[PDB]
Amino acid sequence: MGHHHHHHSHMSWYHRDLSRAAAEELLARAGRDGSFLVRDSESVAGAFALCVLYQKHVHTYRILPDGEDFLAVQTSQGVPVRRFQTLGELIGLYAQPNQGLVCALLLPV
Structure with missing residues (x-):
C-alpha cells in the first residue's frame, strides 16, 4: 500500500562547491x-581535483587542462x-x- 520513489536518484561525485575539508571528510x-x-x-590555474580514500589514507590529486583543452x-x-576530453573517461x-593510484577508483561512496 503506497508508491513513493522519487527521481534524481544520483549521488553525483562532481561538486565545484564542496571544498577539501568537507570532501575528504565526506569520504x-x-x-x-x-x-x-x-x-x-x-x-590553482583553473583545474579540477580528485580526492580518493583507502585504509585511513586520503590522497588528493589535481587534474589540469594545462594550456590547450585536454584534462x-x-x-x-x-x-x-x-589526457581526457571528459571527467567520465578519467573515472x-x-x-x-594504473601504477600510482592508492587502490584505483572502486566507488564514490
Missing part, C-alpha cells in the same frame, strides 16, 4: 574504501599519462589499476 565519515569524488580546485592527471612521470580509466 572519511561515509567510508567504503576506493572512495572517490571530483571537487573544485582552490583556484591530464599526474599520477607519476614515468607512468604513461592520459573509467582510473577505476583500473
Whole structure:
C-alpha cells in the first residue's frame, strides 16, 4: 500500500562547491574504501581535483587542462599519462589499476 520513489536518484561525485575539508571528510565519515569524488580546485590555474580514500589514507590529486583543452592527471612521470576530453573517461580509466593510484577508483561512496 503506497508508491513513493522519487527521481534524481544520483549521488553525483562532481561538486565545484564542496571544498577539501568537507570532501575528504565526506569520504572519511561515509567510508567504503576506493572512495572517490571530483571537487573544485582552490583556484590553482583553473583545474579540477580528485580526492580518493583507502585504509585511513586520503590522497588528493589535481587534474589540469594545462594550456590547450585536454584534462591530464599526474599520477607519476614515468607512468604513461592520459589526457581526457571528459571527467567520465578519467573515472573509467582510473577505476583500473594504473601504477600510482592508492587502490584505483572502486566507488564514490
